[model samples]
Target: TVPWFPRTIQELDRFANQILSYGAELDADHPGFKDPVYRARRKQFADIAYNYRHGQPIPRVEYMEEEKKTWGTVFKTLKSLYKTHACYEYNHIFPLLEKYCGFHEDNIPQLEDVSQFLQTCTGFRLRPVAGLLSSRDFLGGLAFRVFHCTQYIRHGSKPMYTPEPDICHELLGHVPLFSDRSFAQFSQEIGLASLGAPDEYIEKLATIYWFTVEFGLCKQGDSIKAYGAGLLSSFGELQYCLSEKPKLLPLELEKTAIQNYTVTEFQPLYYVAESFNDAKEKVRNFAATIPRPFSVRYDPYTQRIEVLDN
Candidate 1:
């Protein structure tokens, strides 16, 4: 008899078929057409499937084993920490986006319209995913009305940063703004921009995303407030981002595109926007100038080296 954890064999087969159908629809509607990065990711997924079928070394390990004692302890502590943080509450965040941020009522639609609509509306959904992606897959999600989420959740004692995205990062950091129309529109525009952008441009785009989406700040009247999830979910960085002692600059597309940054420590600099609409408009204008390098080089004035390998 087979194990019953994931599902019965029949159920697994049915789920696999459903996933294939979903992927086909995504391929048809998104900007992945003839894109090498997207093709490579598809190939990776195929290889994983082939390996599983052939009983190959799939690297399965159980956290409950004695050999994994240290790993298990670390994981448990992190899980507990996340549970207490506001970031873990998906319920509170999801409804806010659906009701306030303009997420479309339909599941999947034209990526452009959907993003524009979201700019005026609010809310986004969580679609769990795995693995690193090429620029094509990254852009495809934005164009296809879906946001990929990592299945992994972080541990509590892991300090302020983790190299990989965890549940806290996706749901706590990103989902709230998914309900905000301006932010959603900005994200979609960024996605559309990448459809025609060369691989070299990805580093700059990623940098912009890091500052604004991941660790951005904005003025709420006279005071700077925490909005970016990367900061909001982090205990140490949130206070750091909003503090008046660091370098804070107005959200200018040109400045952001060319501005180099380092993320080894908590962010020492931030880009602030007046509103989400400002962010959206900036991205739309920036998209028009794709396939060209910025007039000025973005130097973060730090020696942390490049975090985004591109």
Candidate 2:
């Protein structure tokens, strides 16, 4: 059965109120909103508000029956895959994350001891935001150590990938690291850097995020380990990134900024940071070079970096 939470009318009402207030803010500046693609995104948030306030069934990405069946199948598939690999035990850290951390109760998998571990560690919370935020919106949250989670969740059948940011990608892939201060701080720095960045620079910024936040790896002795959610959540990429055959390079901010990547296929190359501290220091140094708006005039020549084609 799909998990259900207690129906707290007060909580639902409060959530709806917030969404409406934000929607109004967006409507006032609709013309300046990020892009046309996000027009539907604003309405979706508004729809969420309406459903929550009325205690009505909220729309899910997939049909309810299909979602449930997919969930069960995916769970079973994950279990079997893990069993075959003997490395399954290593990936079974979700239970601990839920118990020790601040993940929503409905999302927890089995294993209460893991949950207890999270409860004892520094916990983190997920705050929802409207679609793709401005650089400031992205960075400011990180400066304060709050990770902004996209409210959408992925459908079960989309086990391989999804075009939009979904719940599994946010809740499952990210929350685990929110428990780590270094990882949390790194996330914040990345957001802060993106805040003042120009539109032309966003694609590059996304590449950095895609490499580090989504598919980053770390060297542990002679072998590499997976930490990025994009890889962590996937059964395929996780294995591919760690395999000795792929082109893995040390994480370099300047190179990362220039590197271009495609999302449709599993990454051909992966970047590794010596340590989280090293990653943070690299980001801090790079961010210092980004000029703030209204301070020195924008210089496209110096601000723009060469794009990588692989």
Candidate 3:
């Protein structure tokens, strides 16, 4: 059988399932591995994503008290740092989400409600995913302004540390900033560039996504601030990125895209953007030079991608 690739949003769910198996078993080192209750709860959440349809309303997770406590710890700690550490756009949008989308320390907002909020603000929306996704499938969704978010919270034992991108990471780290217009545009540009790109370019584009969308820092006056979701959702790294520890560099496309980094530990290096708009423009210019036979666009009214042959 020939391998299937998604040309439109409708095909992405199967495309995701085909490329990776989100196994029912957690890794032995995972904090929740020994806990049968947590493991079963995770399986339940994964089932939601496995069975999710393209346009169906995201299923609501009735978060347990323990899950909410984990979310509370991440939220309360991150909020205290946002004024000094987070970018202006994130600070601006987060409070609005709190008021409108039930973003409180004790309440974990639902993907459907958060998706609706983003649609109103920037036309971006969220879809549920079982666990981690391949860079190709993950970035593909961004072209259409869709974020494949996980529904499970991090293990309660280590609220401050999660080995995977759980609901806390998605909601606290990613969801707020997708509402920022320029941030949204910057994200989709990377997404658009990844479609049918050569494998090497896909690797390069994933690096770009890693630096900018995930762990990027940006200038605000003289001091750099955290805008990347990886930093924003991570309290430990958020402080470390802004501290005088990591090697800070200007976000030039060639340099940033080629730089290597690790995921399981704090990044020892970070690329600081002039601003989100600057990052978006550089990505657009870089994307143009990618070797692809066709270009694509998202037709929002119909919620499909239009493939434009060059």
Candidate 4:
């Protein structure tokens, strides 16, 4: 929270309300939207929210055997695909998380373990939630270098797919690249740009995030590789991205920022960056245009965002 501007719960209602229209209000077993799986997960995360104390150890979740199997099913399939489709940066950092962070087919990686692994490589860490949050709250946490992830697995029937982001998506798609300095820096830059932004800018930031972090591609020696978590975690999408069918446009910040994407099917459009450095350079250059004034920096020792302006 760079600017740390407080808003009424009334403000939150608007954010959640907009997302609910996307069919976020239903459970995985609910009424269908545009696509069969689209908007299929529960909207309200949990009945009660728990707040943690400062310096407390992050909670460890014990998942069910069925959930573990679901993770393995998707993981086993996606792991093979990652070799062919995942970007170099992701492939390079993945082993570090796999070995050090306890990522494997037998068990789902725990949040605290993943957090510890990230703290060593970069400053990123995971905090678990019952389900996906409104875009505002989730993106706001990213601004603070905190990511709120889900601990639960998606329902078993849909192992390779999730109408909502689940633990599989968090561990397989999102986790590894956080260890890459350039990727980590780009993520935080997106977070930093989010603070005190207008709704239009927030939408733009979400659009930018959708393309780059969720579904982005980058060039390796000759072939394009996917670094976006969404592509890296799902077998079908990874193949779709590596296939010739989808249009892979070069990463252009403003063009991406306003570009509309889909949750119903494979993204027909993807943004490809030259490299991690290229992604950072492109995203950072555009982020500099985010219309906000306060200078901010993260204070690691205190785990707080401090305004640096005089």
* Best model per TM-score: 3
lDDT (Cα, tens digit) per residue for candidate 3, span 1-310: 2123466678777765543464534678888889999989988887888889888899887899989998999899988998888898888988899899999998999999999999999999899888767788888889888898888888899889887788888887898789999899999989888887777878899999899888999998887888889999988898899988999989998988888888889999999999888998998899888877677777878777788778
Off by over 4 Å in 3: 1-5, 22-25
lDDT of each: 0.49, 0.53, 0.85, 0.70
Off by over 4 Å in 2: 1-46, 49-69, 75-93, 98-124, 130-136, 156-159, 200-203, 293-310
State in Å the error of residue 62, model 1.
14
Write one digit per residue (lDDT tens) for candidate 4, span 1-310. Answer: 4334423312222232222333332544522333333222322223211333223456665666867898889888888887777877778888877778778898888777887787788777666555546555667666545666665566666676677777789888998888777888888777766767767787898898899889989888888888888888878888988888999898988899999877888899898888777776776677667766666565667555666553
C-alpha displacement of 152 in model 2, angstroms? Answer: 3.7
Q: Estimate each model's TM-score.
A: 0.56, 0.62, 0.94, 0.83
In model 1, what lDDT does residue 65 have?
Answer: 31
Model 1 misplacement above 4 A: 1-123, 156-161, 292-310
The per-candidate count of clashes, in order, stands at 20, 16, 0, 0
Candidate ordering by TM-score (highest first): 3, 4, 2, 1
Worst 10 residues of 3 by lDDT: 16-25
Worst lDDT 10-window in candidate 4: 40-49
Cα RMSD, model 2: 12.8
* Ranking of models by lDDT: 3, 4, 2, 1
